[PDB]
Amino acid sequence: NEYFNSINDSKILSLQNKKNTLMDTSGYNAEVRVEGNVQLNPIFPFDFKLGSSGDDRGKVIVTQNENIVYNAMYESFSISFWIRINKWVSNLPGYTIIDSVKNNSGWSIGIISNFLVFTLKQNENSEQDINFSYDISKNAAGYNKWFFVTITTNMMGNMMIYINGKLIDTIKVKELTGINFSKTITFQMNKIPNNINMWIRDFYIFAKELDDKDINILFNSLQYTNVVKDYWGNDLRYDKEYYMINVNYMNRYMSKKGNGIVFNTRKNNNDFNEGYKIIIKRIRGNTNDTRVRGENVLYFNTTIDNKQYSLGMYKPSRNLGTDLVPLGALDQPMDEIRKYGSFIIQPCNTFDYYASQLFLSSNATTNRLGILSIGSYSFKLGDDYWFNHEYLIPVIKIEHYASLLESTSTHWVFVPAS
Missing domain, CATH: 2.80.10.50 (Trefoil (Acidic Fibroblast Growth Factor, subunit A))
Structure with a gap:
């Protein structure tokens, strides 16, 4: 299985949980600070849990080396991860869940109503975003299931979003001059001005644009297929x-x-x-x-x-x-x-x-x-x-x-x- 080896070679960040400890198994060794109440599953899938609660609430921060970000700052990159949200109602208010924006430029993953939106930002005025909307008819009790997101983004090419291996939406990356990508990614459930839980696991970022066959390989490699699920x-x-x-x-x-x-x-x-x-x-x-x-x-x-x-x-x-x-x-x-x-x-x-x-x-x-x-x-x-x-x-x-x-x-x- 070279398929698997070739992909891993482009892996610039690998947020795994080993030895009951969140770390970066990419090799480029990013710093991983865990502030607040961040429950950590000891059982597989070794996920980590966050909340929207007040006061001491969960916050996972990841800070990278300048050398390796700089490389992916203008070419091509992909983000892939397992996520779950409990009581993801359709009327849900807006939330930022995963954020990588420093001085009003970067990227950010957030959720509002039945949408999981991925925004690309250059300044406080202009921003282009792609999203996935869940089928409310099929999930009246809330979209509470585990699902595998993947976001491929080519800066002069295209910006696509996948859920469970299926391409959902795909839009053209606009001309984005002066777009500075942050060296920090922050997992924290921050409400948007004017009580839910979130589980994350196996957060990877890659230095290339993953294709359908690569994504679905990754998707499949990241689960126990013979273990029946609820x-x-x-x-x-x-x-x-x-x-x-x-x-x-x-x-x-x-x-x-x-x-x-x-x-x-x-x-x-x-x-x-x-x-x-x-x-x-x-x-x-x-x-x-x-x-x-x-x-x-x-x-x-x-x-x-x-x-x-x-x-x-x-x-x-x-x-x-x-x-x-x-x-x-x-x-x-x-x-x-x-x-x-x-x-x-x-x-x-x-x-x-x-x-x-x-x-x-x-x-x-x-x-x-x-x-x-x-x-x-x-x-x-x-x-x-x-x-x-x-x-x-x-x-x-x-x-x-x-x-x-x-x-x-x-x-x-x-x-x-x-």
């Missing part, structure tokens, strides 16, 4: 309460009627605080460290009333369709769970979400009998006596699922109840 992009974990949601039905929560699990309409889309929660329990796995990974055999528990059930197949009051069998809440021992309630998880990540697919397992082995989907069907559940009713239920298609294998109706996500 809705916000953190490592999905066993023995932790999540809300299980289908990607095609984000406005439904999980409820129960009789033996059946039935999906119901959310009251609102501010939080995900609604319905019954599930807990992922491991059965089979290559590693054993609480993180859920591809090809793991697993099952789901959930505490409904003061009892605790496990998700599993059951026989409905009448046939729902060919090869189709509902998943429901059952009080069953492990021997039954292994036969009729065990799944093989496969991570399925896209630009829009961190999701996963779930395959019914044969006797808690990795051999796949079917796939977990969702659908509305008419039958009897619980007290239902006189009439059938339409229930939106989780359903397993057995044997023939090549059609569903590519459908987003089999994409499941998990939102923590923190």
Whole structure:
């Protein structure tokens, strides 16, 4: 993998976290001061955390050597990093998050409303900026997920912005004479005149203009692809309460009627605080460290009333369709769970979400009998006596699922109840 080596050669700043310490692994050794309350994750991804709070609030400062800035001050450069913001509402007020401006010239990354804007400044009057806007329809609860920004900028060429490898917006760099780039970059959440958290990790700057194939290599090299992720992009974990949601039905929560699990309409889309929660329990796995990974055999528990059930197949009051069998809440021992309630998880990540697919397992082995989907069907559940009713239920298609294998109706996500 030269691809990886050739890129690193142009790396002028590498803000990593080693040995529980923020430092510059570029080689050019920038100074890294950590003022205020800056929480530091000891677990991977070794991110560092900031806040918008008053008084003692987080501030990370990075100061560079003149020699290496001077080189990239007029040619070409790229900025790339992982970022996450909690409660990134659409009505959010303006904030400067990452700033590199000294005497009213430089560059600055900031966020306002549903926008993450990257501005280029020469003087207090004139400034050109490129931005990314998140899809408010797809993220009613706030864009709270981890995402990988990349900004390529050529001073006589072009100024582009990428999110998760996908080029979002691209505009022409105007004639910018007298543009002085600062030797300091400051990570701090400063509100703009007239309470959120921010996680940053792996902040790199390069001395060239990265292309699509380079960016996506970087994007992919900077994650554990086989570690399944929750809705916000953190490592999905066993023995932790999540809300299980289908990607095609984000406005439904999980409820129960009789033996059946039935999906119901959310009251609102501010939080995900609604319905019954599930807990992922491991059965089979290559590693054993609480993180859920591809090809793991697993099952789901959930505490409904003061009892605790496990998700599993059951026989409905009448046939729902060919090869189709509902998943429901059952009080069953492990021997039954292994036969009729065990799944093989496969991570399925896209630009829009961190999701996963779930395959019914044969006797808690990795051999796949079917796939977990969702659908509305008419039958009897619980007290239902006189009439059938339409229930939106989780359903397993057995044997023939090549059609569903590519459908987003089999994409499941998990939102923590923190």
